[PDB]
């Protein structure tokens, strides 16, 4: 019996991820001193990972266990259209947290007049609209005809679609993140006292470290898939086998299941908030 092991492992991982991403939302939505414009973006990342790990991953698990799509033809398009939108929304959410931290560090005295509540909400709406456009843009542009067996659900391999998706979903926010963090690290290295007091300085110097840990986990998890796909799509000589392909896109789902453990370990308000939520 080989299906039992994979079924138990993937079911346990999904059932861990759903409860983690519910607990992250509940710990911010319960307490009152955690109400600022920075924590709402963490709630947004938790919402995107919750929708992914509660809608998409069971059907790919059953597809990996059985070996053929046994639900029809209309669901094979809806699944492959939600699977791209969730990852694109998560990457652009990380990019907007990086921009917010740069504006917070570089102008430490005129921050509560620049980043108000209204501009944060409008930036959230603009990010969701741009993600929904750039995700399902090229999916309906490189449309190929369907086979005649309907027990198979495959993906596109036109080099235009692969190039457009890999250029508009991964390598465009990465440059913005690295430019903002390079300028922020130079300013933190060269200065003595940021906000005119010791307490505000030592409180400002730690959220940047937490967001560095989050970005460092995300890049390490999602880089080999977006590095092994277009090389095999363009140059067909160095295409790998069908067994090493199936790990480089399961790492990207392990990332969504492993994300909510960073906040209790690398903080002291999140641990108290998690314990207070679990107390009830």
């Amino acid at each position, epitope marked *: 019996s080989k299906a039992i092991l994979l079924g138990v492992i993937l079911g346990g991982l999904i059932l861990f991820g759903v409860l983690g991403n519910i607990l992250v939302i509940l710990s911010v939505a319960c307490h009152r001193h955690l109400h600022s414009v920075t924590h709402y973006y963490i709630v947004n990342l938790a919402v995107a990972d919750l929708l992914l790990t509660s809608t998409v991953l069971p059907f790919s698990a059953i597809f990996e266990v059985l070996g053929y799509w046994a639900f029809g033809r209309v669901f094979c398009n809806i699944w492959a259209a939600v699977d791209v939108l969730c990852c694109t929304a998560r990457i652009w959410g990380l990019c907007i947290i990086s921009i917010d931290r740069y504006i917070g560090v570089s102008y430490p005295l005129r921050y509560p007049t620049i980043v108000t509540q209204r501009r944060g909400l409008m930036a959230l709406l603009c990010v969701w609209a741009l993600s929904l456009v750039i995700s399902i843009g090229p999916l309906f542009g490189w449309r190929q005809p369907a086979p005649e067996d309907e027990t198979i659900c495959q993906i596109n391999e036109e080099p235009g679609y692969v190039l457009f998706s890999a250029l508009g979903s991964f390598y465009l926010p990465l440059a913005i993140i690295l430019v903002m963090y390079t300028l922020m690290i130079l300013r*933190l*290295k060269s200065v*003595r*006292l940021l906000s005119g007091s*010791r307490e505000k*300085d*030592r409180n400002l*110097r*730690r959220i*940047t*470290r937490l967001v560095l840990i989050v970005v460092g986990c995300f890049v390490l998890c999602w880089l080999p898939f977006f590095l092994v796909m277009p090389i095999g799509s363009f140059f067909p000589d160095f295409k790998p086998s069908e067994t090493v392909f199936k790990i480089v896109f399961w790492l990207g789902y392990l990332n969504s299941c492993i994300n909510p453990i960073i906040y209790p370990c690398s903080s002291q308000e999140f641990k108290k908030a998690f314990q207070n939520v679990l107390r009830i």
Partner: nanobody
Amino acid sequence: QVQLQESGGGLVQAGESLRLSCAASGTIFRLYDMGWYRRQRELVASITSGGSTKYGDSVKGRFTISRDNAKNTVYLQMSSLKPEDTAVYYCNAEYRTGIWEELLDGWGQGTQVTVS
């Protein structure tokens, strides 16, 4: 765990010259400020990281303050000493021990100079 060491004490009559020195040792990321304090705490000399010096009111600038950055050392040159300068002098420093850390200072032991 950063510790400071002082040197340059003595005991002589009035109308002479001397030089004191202070130096840090330990694990440091950067040093931001140094100085000297008489007796009771009061300012007599203070220098910055850039080089813009400052002085105190009880002394009319007759001493000299200088800083060696690469060895983490601060000096003090005293000349034409008055009989009213018999006290105990102390060093000081400010530092940091990491880029994600908190600024915190630390005092030193002290040195004795006796003049008549």
